[PDB]
Design a protein around this ligand. Structure first.
Ligand code: HEM
Length: 110
């Protein structure tokens, strides 16, 4: 089985390194990147992201509902363009399958 938990950990490392102001919208605001793996708010967020990935691949993901929830946090197209790039880098690092089609489905509702 693909280790998506390892992929997701690398994705958040990439996203907040390049766009640290995005981290301000989360319950782990202000926590050093090298301390995220022991942080409770981060472990919850990471688990929900792994879940969405396994739902997208297994065929049950609700992209419209995820997009609507991101609009409700004032998170939109520009942020997801950035995320697509960061997640491609994380997948490559681990020899895991590309997830670009899943991200495009979210963008179609933004
Ligand atoms: C690979 C792209 C992304 C995926 C797959 C993803 C997935 C998720 C999921 C599954 C949730 C939980 C929704 C729920 O509980 O119903 C969530 C919440 C959230 N996302 Fe994203 N997300 C992505 C990118 C982003 C980006 C770029 C931002 C920019 C700041 C962002 C900001 C947030 C915030 C603020 C929440 C709410 C967290 C909280 O409840 O404290 N997300 N996301």
């Amino acid at each position: 089985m693909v280790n998506w938990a390892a992929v997701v950990d690398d994705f958040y490392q990439e996203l907040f390194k390049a766009h640290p102001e995005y981290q301000n919208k989360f319950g782990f605001k202000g926590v050093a990147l090298g301390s995220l793996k022991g942080n409770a708010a981060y472990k919850t967020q990471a688990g929900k992201t792994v879940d969405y990935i396994n739902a997208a691949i297994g065929g049950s993901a609700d992209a419209a509902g995820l997009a609507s929830r991101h609009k409700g946090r004032n998170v939109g197209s520009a942020e997801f363009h950035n995320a697509k790039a960061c997640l491609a880098k994380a997948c490559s690092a681990h020899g895991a399958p590309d997830l670009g089609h899943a991200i495009d489905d979210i963008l179609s509702h933004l």
